[PDB]
Design an enzyme around this catalytic site. Structure first.
Site: not given
Ligand code: SF4
Ligand code: SF4
Ligand code: SF4
Ligand code: FCO
Ligand SMILES: [Ca+2]
Ligand SMILES: [Ca+2]
Ligand SMILES: [Ca+2]
Ligand SMILES: [Ca+2]
Ligand code: NI
Ligand SMILES: [S]
Lengths: 279, 489
Positions: A14, A17, A122, A160, A204, A207, A227, A233, A242, A254, A260, A263
């Site tokens: 797409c 990336c 992908c 992604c 997690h 987090c 949460c 999530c 992340c 996210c 989340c 991805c």
């Protein structure tokens, strides 16, 4: 001194990336292109087109044989003899035209590369194009290499899209290894071929909402405190950094914003769906 | 005396595009546009929780995912029977508007500009056409040629950072970009705080400054050098727009209004009159005559005799229509930026107040770039206003439940043109999902009646005085800002 030669090819992608790579900081994309890599072929941004672009790609793959990184964005569709992804046309020495499928392109370039780097879920794992309902025989790089019996060093950088830090970091680590392999060993990879540097942490476990999770304080809707588990999530089953790194130069991520969706994982999207139903 | 030129890949567009032209007596006399990659999102979507669609559809395209997300959540809002709050509407506009700025800037600089600007002598700026008719070739005064080229190239380089800042703006309330998390059925997932609104605003002012002080002046300057490029790449001169950025809670008023302009005449947009043909596309339809999207079918067939593209062929009242900034700006006919009014007078001797004052010049290679730049400014004015309207703390999300059986349609304009998503739900799952996207309207093949798609038609008459350096073919194509991921999905 010398820049890492890169041939960047797109299959069932797409362009996300690539766009995520354009968002890099420290270094930013200008410095990446002028100082870090030689981006020899990239269909989205390169000056040349058609015959000239392809001829340049093949010239680099020959001149820099065993000494360029093949970057792959998007999946490889194998149904209908590869005809769900035509990447170009080659004009032989008699004037006749021949289309090139993604299958043919990867079969050609991967053995010429120093290493192949599958950027994005992908190319790494199949992702959305390979999800339930597709009829294109969409395949990941690792599965295509297995089917083709291609033995070439392969590193997966999923997401992604992937965070630019993951793509830049992995490429720089690979190049450093090639330049001095004993000073710079290759990054350790997990069982799915992705670097533990970026994909070793569980979201997690790391987090900032974990205290709330432990106290059964769950957000009733997106815009309530707590949460995000009941909102869908997938942090519990997802491995990426992340929570530490955040997104878009530390602006948001996210889980703070929403949920989340897992991805970076090899079973994204089907194993992470429905997205708004708890795990 | 015909010569065929085939360009595959046509680079510096999104996705997989092939262009074929026939040239005779120094001009294009026929053309074919082909999208060569298919994923089948409409098939993949079937059977899923309908709420998943606003994440799945973004992966159609990483350049315009906010447009698809917007269309999807609006289709869901419609099907689920939920009304978005004022602050939800505004927040969605701020998320999406920030990417309009990113997309137009990305397009002009990082996709289009290398057909005019000579970059440094390192990949990916080289190799390039030997006779590329660049600023450094066109401008005969060498110091002026160098200065203008450097001016353009420095903007290209600066724009790399400006577009990145636009994605910080998208992430502010969108979570991350590409592929936002912040828009869902029922509104937006994060209520803007005063601090984050100020943070967005500070970044926005930097983007806005670049638009007004650098981008608009470069475009008008570029057009003043390439005046010939306002006189070719014409096409059907039919345009359509669906409305984008609703300015009130009942979606009756927009920043850029819906409308159709066909054969010199304005009319209202009626969604009942959209249909897709597949006579020259790699798809099977269960019935002849073209299909309205509400009964659309996605049955790929790469072996279909006579077909040459994975792009379907949408027609409005059986007419090809183009989409994008030219379409929206023509339909709305807004007042031009102060920069545009000034530079049109100073550099061209043109008196122009409103977009339509460009007349025939709008429907051309350079007209499409001008429309896109003007729309970037117009969108910035709107974002500046929305930043004052957004209310810190005000609820952005309304709860909903997945219906057993429903239908909904989301209408918007992606940066590249008119976009709708049609959603049909049965047993709480996606029964059919049909996407009619922007580049779908531009880069389509011939319909069953042989009518060329807009890019195909606009190529007719484009000058190719040098067959080995056919630079105007790519210039025309790129003026449409095609996205083949969106076109085919
Ligand atoms: S991994 Fe995601 S962002 Fe990257 S090409 Fe695939 S769909 Fe696009
Ligand atoms: S479920 Fe999600 S929000 Fe809750 S603690 Fe785990 S990762 Fe964080
Ligand atoms: S938080 Fe989850 S969905 Fe977001 S980028 Fe990280 S792994 Fe992907
Ligand atoms: N902009 C954009 Fe993408 C296209 N064409 C969509 O919709
Ligand atoms: Ca430098
Ligand atoms: Ca083999
Ligand atoms: Ca074929
Ligand atoms: Ca469609
Ligand atoms: Ni797109
Ligand atoms: S977008």
């Amino acid at each position: 001194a010398k820049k890492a030669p890169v041939i960047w090819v797109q299959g069932q992608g797409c362009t996300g990336c690539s766009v995520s790579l354009l968002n890099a900081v420290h270094p930013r994309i200008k410095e990446i292109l002028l100082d870090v890599i030689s981006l020899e072929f990239h269909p989205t941004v390169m000056a040349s087109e058609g015959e000239m672009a392809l001829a340049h790609m093949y010239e680099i793959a020959e001149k820099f044989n065993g000494n360029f990184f093949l970057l792959v964005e998007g999946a490889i569709p194998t149904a209908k003899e590869g005809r769900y992804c035509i990447v170009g046309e080659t004009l032989d020495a008699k004037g006749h035209h021949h289309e090139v499928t993604m299958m043919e392109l990867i079969r050609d370039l991967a053995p010429k590369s120093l290493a192949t780097v599958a950027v994005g879920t992908c190319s790494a794992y199949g992702g959305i194009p390979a999800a339930e309902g597709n009829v294109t025989g969409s395949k990941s790089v690792r599965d295509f290499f297995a089917d083709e019996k291609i033995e070439k060093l392969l590193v997966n950088v999923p997401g992604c899209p992937p965070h630019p830090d993951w793509m830049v970091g992995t490429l720089v680590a690979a190049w450093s290894h090639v330049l001095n392999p004993t000073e710079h060993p290759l990054p350790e990879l997990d069982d799915d071929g992705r670097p533990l540097l970026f994909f070793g942490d569980n979201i997690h476990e790391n987090c900032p909402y974990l205290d709330k999770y432990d106290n059964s304080e769950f957000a009733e809707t997106f815009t309530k405190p707590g949460c995000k588990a009941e909102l869908g999530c997938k942090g519990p089953s997802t491995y990426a950094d992340c929570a530490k790194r955040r997104w878009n130069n530390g602006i948001n991520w996210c889980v703070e914003n929403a949920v989340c969706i897992g991805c970076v994982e090899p079973d994204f999207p089907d194993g992470k769906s429905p997205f708004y139903v708890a795990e | 005396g015909k010569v065929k030129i085939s360009i595959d890949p046509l680079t510096r567009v999104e996705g997989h595009l092939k262009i074929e032209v026939e040239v005779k007596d120094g001009k294009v006399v026929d053309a074919k546009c082909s999208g060569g990659m298919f994923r089948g999102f409409e098939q993949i979507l079937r059977g899923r929780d309908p709420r998943d669609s606003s994440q799945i559809v973004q992966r159609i395209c990483g350049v315009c995912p906010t447009a698809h997300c917007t269309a999807s959540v609006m289709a869901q809002d419609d099907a689920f029977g939920v009304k978005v709050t004022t602050n939800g509407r505004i927040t969605r506009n701020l998320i999406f508007g920030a990417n309009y700025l990113q997309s137009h800037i990305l397009h002009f600089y990082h996709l289009a500009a290398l057909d005019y600007v000579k970059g440094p002598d390192v990949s990916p700026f080289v190799p390039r056409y030997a006779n590329a008719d660049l600023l450094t070739d066109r401008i005969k005064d060498g110091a002026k040629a160098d200065a203008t080229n450097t001016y353009g190239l420095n903007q290209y380089l600066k724009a790399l950072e400006i577009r990145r800042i636009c994605h910080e703006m998208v992430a502010m309330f969108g979570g991350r970009m590409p592929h936002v998390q912040g828009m869902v059925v029922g509104g937006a997932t994060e209520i803007p705080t005063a601090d984050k609104v100020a943070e967005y605003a500070a970044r926005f002012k930097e983007v806005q400054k670049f638009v007004i002080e650098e981008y608009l002046p470069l475009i008008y300057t570029l057009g003043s050098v390439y005046t010939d490029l306002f006189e070719t790449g014409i096409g059907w001169k039919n345009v359509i727009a669906f409305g984008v950025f609703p300015e009130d809670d009942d979606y009756k008023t927009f920043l850029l209004k819906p409308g159709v302009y066909i054969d010199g005449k304005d009319e209202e947009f009626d969604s009942k009159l959209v249909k897709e043909y597949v006579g020259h596309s790699f798809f099977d339809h269960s019935a002849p005559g073209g299909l309205h999207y509400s009964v659309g079918e996605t049955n790929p067939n790469p072996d279909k005799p006579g077909a040459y593209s994975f792009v379907k062929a949408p027609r409005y009242k059986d007419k090809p229509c183009e989409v994008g900034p030219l379409a929206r700006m023509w339909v709305q006919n807004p007042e031009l930026s102060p920069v545009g009014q000034k530079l049109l007078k100073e550099l061209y001797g043109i008196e122009a107040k409103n977009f339509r004052d460009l007349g025939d010049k709008a429907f051309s290679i350079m007209g499409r770039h001008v429309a896109r730049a003007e729309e970037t400014w117009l969108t910035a004015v709107a974002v500046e206003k929305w930043l004052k309207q957004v209310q810190p703390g005000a609820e952005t999300y309304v709860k909903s439940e997945i219906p057993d059986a429903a239908e909904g349609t989301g209408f918007t304009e992606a940066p590249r043109g008119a976009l709708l998503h049609y959603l049909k739900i049965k047993d709480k799952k996606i029964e059919n999902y049909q996407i009619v996207s922007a580049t779908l309207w531009n880069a389509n093949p011939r319909d069953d009646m042989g009518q060329r798609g807009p890019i195909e038609e606009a190529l007719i008459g484009v000058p190719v005085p040098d067959i080995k350096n056919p630079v105007n073919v790519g210039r025309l194509v790129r003026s449409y800002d095609p996205x083949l991921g969106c076109a085919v999905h």
